[PDB]
Design a protein around this nucleic acid. Structure first.
Ligand SMILES: Nc1ccn([C@H]2CC[C@@H](COP(=O)(O)OP(=O)(O)OP(=O)(O)O)O2)c(=O)n1
Ligand SMILES: [Zn+2]
Length: 461
RNA sequence: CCAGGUCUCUCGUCCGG
RNA sequence: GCCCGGACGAGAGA
């Protein structure tokens, strides 16, 4: 990805849009019961915690475009992945406007509680003003599509969220791109049966984990993997995707029968953004807040890894690759060990920055003991070895519990953390409950005992 | 008073068959 | 008891 031009939105006849400037995050009843490093990310330039220049920092990610041509390995990658998806029998038809808006089997409705994006946001117009879940009325949306069309600019916000200390000082706040409601609707009309097919088929055929529930999927994963795992992390995945990767996507889409709407992918490539008082253009890269990004990012990941394998190990048999991606996250396997330091070397040639999994300083054998996906580890149940726990380390749960957006959410919030926590085992969980109960508000909370959660987990199989 | 994307999963409240 | 569905809220993950 790479910026092409900034300029006051006035010169282009675009509205100024004002984001809020204060975080909604605030210390919890538990802020001092537990230790933690993270704090709310920089939202504005005038932030005392800044050790650098903000806007320079947040737009830094657009690292450039390495390649544009689909090379021979990419082509092979495309053919293999596409042929895989072909076995699912994906419905290639446009989705009617009603299902695109209101959801169908495998596709949730548009989120009524989020922004409707440009131009609606500058007209003080909301999704609730346009959509009606009970009647599923399409008349008003249809009119708006006719009136304003598609391919509208995105609106740019900084995400309000917790960030490590170094990310705060260095102004590394993540940016969000708010899709227009017209575009979300158009993208779902085009690609909705694709999204649903993916959501219904998490596993190694789609090469995607979208639609999975870790409490249950964790037990499937090791059975689906080949004998030898490998994994790594990307630095700046989306912003480092060069145009060649998107053509490769379009080629996969053409192959499985979406050829007639691959023009939508070109739109995701040449995008305009409104940020505060400015307007810019990006070339390449896929905006995160666009519809389908989850599916498309996972798809490209499937392409990237096949490509790197074909380049790095001549004569590799891709039929023996088993991988599951969730966007840039990935757990992968092959019947013989593959060296991710070698994969990362080849990655450089396609613009990709690949580093050791889970922030190791060096590349090391990935084992069932140290491998993580969706931030969770894998640990066999002591009593039932074939049942695997997704184990999210207490560290993250402690960071989360220390903050709140609204103290009215305390019960919901802590209870959700419990469902993540208990997988660390009865002893760590009980220690967790004691801490919570060490302050009065914690004693007002109804929290599940270990044995309840465990029986619930066993039952759910 | 509001404001701040796309998705998945889960829990909770309430309401149904 | 068990099943299923809906509206809203929240949490985590990508
Ligand atoms: N709020 C978010 C967070 C993540 N993602 C998607 C986009 C990128 C991908 C990977 O996200 P992370 O690896 O968790 O963050 P990052 O983009 O690499 O930023 P950082 O390196 O600072 O964590 O997931 C997203 O769509 N929306
Ligand atoms: Zn442009």
């Amino acid at each position: 990805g790479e910026i092409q031009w900034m300029r006051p939105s006035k010169e282009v006849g675009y509205p100024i849009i004002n984001a809020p400037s204060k975080t909604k995050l605030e210390p919890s009843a538990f802020h001092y019961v537990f230790e933690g490093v993270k704090e709310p990310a920089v939202l504005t330039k005038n932030d005392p915690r800044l050790k650098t220049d903000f806007e320079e920092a947040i737009f830094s990610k657009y690292v450039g475009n390495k390649i544009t041509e689909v090379d021979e390995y990419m082509k092979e990658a495309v053919d293999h992945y596409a042929g895989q998806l072909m076995s699912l029998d994906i419905n290639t038809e446009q989705m009617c406007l009603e299902d695109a808006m209101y959801g169908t089997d495998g596709l949730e409705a548009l989120d009524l509680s989020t922004s409707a994006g440009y131009p609606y946001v500058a007209m003080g117009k909301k999704k609730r003003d346009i959509l009606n879940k009970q009647t599923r009325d399409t008349k008003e949306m249809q009119k708006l599509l006719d009136t304003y069309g598609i391919n509208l600019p995105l609106v740019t916000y900084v995400k309000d969220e917790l960030r490590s200390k170094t990310k705060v000082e260095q102004g590394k706040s993540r940016l969000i791109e708010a899709s227009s409601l017209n575009d979300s609707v158009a993208m779902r009309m085009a690609f909705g049966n694709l999204y649903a097919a993916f959501h219904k088929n998490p596993g190694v055929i789609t090469g995607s984990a979208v639609g999975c529930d870790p409490d249950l999927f964790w037990s499937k994963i090791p059975v689906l993997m080949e004998e030898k795992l490998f994994a790594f992390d990307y630095t700046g995945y989306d912003a480092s995707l060069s145009p060649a990767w998107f053509e490769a996507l379009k080629m996969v889409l053409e192959k499985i029968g979406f050829g007639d709407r691959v023009d939508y992918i070109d739109y995701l490539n040449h995008s305009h953004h409104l940020y505060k008082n400015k307007t810019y253009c990006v070339k390449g890269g896929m905006p995160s807040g666009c519809s389908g990004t989850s599916i498309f990012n996972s798809m490209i990941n499937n392409l990237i890894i096949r490509t790197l394998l074909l380049k790095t190990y001549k004569g590799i048999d891709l039929d023996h690759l088993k991988m599951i991606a969730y966007g840039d996250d990935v757990i992968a396997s092959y019947p013989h060990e593959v060296d991710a330091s070698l994969l990362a070397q080849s990655g450089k040639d396609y613009g990709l920055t690949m580093t050791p999994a889970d922030k190791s300083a060096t590349f090391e054998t990935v084992t069932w003991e140290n491998v993580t996906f969706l931030k969770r580890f894998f640990r066999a149940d002591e009593k039932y070895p074939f049942l695997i726990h997704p184990v999210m380390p207490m560290k993250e749960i402690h960071e989360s519990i220390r903050w709140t957006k609204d103290p009215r959410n305390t019960q919901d919030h802590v209870r959700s953390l419990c469902l993540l926590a208990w997988h660390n085992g009865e002893e760590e969980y009980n220690k967790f409950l004691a801490k919570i109960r060490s302050v009065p508000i914690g004693r007002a909370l109804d929290l599940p005992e270990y044995s309840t959660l465990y029986r619930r987990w066993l039952d759910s199989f």
